[PDB]
């Protein structure tokens, strides 16, 4: 199971931003202009428009994937090995053979 991580967004108040390139899994990015975001303290920019925002998203492995995970394997020619007990007369013998 993946974990989606949404970073702390980037905000440029009276300018622009551009999407970059990353190596992160399923990395998505988008620029949104005409933005005017608020927090508990109030407004966070000094231009009422032209205040682009950058959104990111990628995925990681969940904290508990160290136990809950699957391994994909390809299998090839299967070879049989047997353990045999052989008793001839008074002696018994144990051996493994291919």
Buried b (16+ CB within 10 A) or exposed e, 14-49: eeeeeeeeeeeeeeeeeeeeebeeeeeeeeebeeee
Of 16 and 62, the one with the shorter C-beta distance to other proteins is 62
Of 8 and 77, the one with the shorter C-beta distance to other proteins is 8
Q: Which residues bind other proteins (CB under 8 A)?
A: 1-2, 4-11, 13-14, 23-26, 28-30, 32, 35-48, 53, 55-70, 72-73, 75, 78, 82, 84, 86, 88-89, 91
Of 16 and 44, the one with the shorter C-beta distance to other proteins is 44
Least distance CB 50 / other proteins (angstroms): 10
């Amino acid at each position: 199971k993946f974990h989606t991580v949404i970073p702390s967004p980037q905000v440029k108040c009276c300018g622009s931003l551009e999407c970059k390139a990353s190596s992160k899994a399923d990395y998505t990015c988008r620029v949104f202009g005409g933005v005017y975001p608020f927090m508990w303290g109030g407004a966070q920019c000094f231009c009422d428009s032209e205040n682009t925002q950058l959104s990111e998203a990628y995925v990681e492995f969940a904290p508990d994937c160290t136990i809950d995970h699957a391994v994909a394997l390809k299998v090839h020619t299967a070879a049989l090995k047997v353990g045999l007990r052989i008793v001839y007369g008074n002696t018994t013998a144990h051996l493994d053979t291919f």
